[PDB]
Symmetry: C3
Subunit: 132 residues, 3 copies
């Protein structure tokens, strides 16, 4: 009945193929124990309205970053970042939606690469707003 | 007593003049039925503290994007995006405020143009945090 | 038991040294009276889960912007912005965490400079999600 997670990447993610899940290595919060770091997946524990937000810093290489917020296998919302130079830029978006118990929410690295360090530029959080 | 909307643009918005409302074509959520897609307006149904957030991806043209979050006819907070090249960039901000029943919250495209597609880069959400 | 602040900078901040606090001059909201504008500090009034978010627009000079969300003296999460030219760009991030009464949350300008005007590009908000 109370759910809130906040996760960060503290090391770089540069997958060898397109459309890979963004796994996280650190949790700033995991109230309700709903977030699986190793899979990078939020497991919905109760039917309700949930809020999600993410900020992904891209690696400082001249290659764009595309990120999707996913519900199961569906793209919900997306973000783009590109510096037009070997520099960082940030891909961010948010969503509010009704979920059912068992729904999985996760972040997909469609294309590009993500910067991770102990300063936690690259973050992903969500919480239960209204139960039902 | 429970209010949450999340809207997206799935087609481009390139108004012919400055200071035009950002209309939305798709709702990811409309708990409480407070958001009018066609006008792009949130109609406050009850006095309370509300949270708003937006992410607007600009068209890939060398022209900056300025967006205002509006309360009735007043600029509340603003966002800027510019790539310095024919590339996308994202204008985002947020606000938390006390509203009265009948207040209207909406997004204004001050200058520039907004990218819309089925991948839903360009989003606008809000919700009731505390009733009163 | 109900806490929500939203603050903005309406004038430029260009500190003479690294790692300075971002003070705010304007409050869009201060439900619970927890935010000290002059220090730019949120004073946690009750143990609970809190959400924070910020958007900082950098000055239009070719110098990057680094911002940290701080808990007492600890970096929680960070943001970067750079245009690669004399142009604005936005440093944003968010976090959800458990705090105790007496904890202080604030924004640190690690390096760079922040743009402030009446259009309120540069914002910082937080609220109590769950008391306990």
């Amino acid at each position: 009945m109370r759910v809130a997670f906040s996760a960060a990447r503290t090391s770089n993610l540069a997958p060898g193929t397109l459309d890979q899940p963004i796994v996280f290595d650190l949790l700033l919060n995991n109230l309700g124990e709903t977030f699986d770091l190793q899979l990078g997946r939020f497991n919905c524990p109760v039917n309700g309205t949930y809020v999600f937000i993410f900020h992904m810093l891209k690696l400082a290489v001249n290659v764009p970053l595309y990120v999707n917020l996913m519900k199961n296998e569906e793209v919900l919302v997306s973000a783009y970042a590109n510096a037009g130079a070997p520099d960082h830029a940030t891909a961010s978006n948010h969503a509010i939606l009704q979920l059912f118990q068992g729904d999985q929410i996760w972040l997909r690295l469609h294309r590009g690469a993500i910067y991770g360090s102990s300063w936690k530029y690259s973050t992903f959080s969500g919480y239960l707003l209204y139960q039902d």
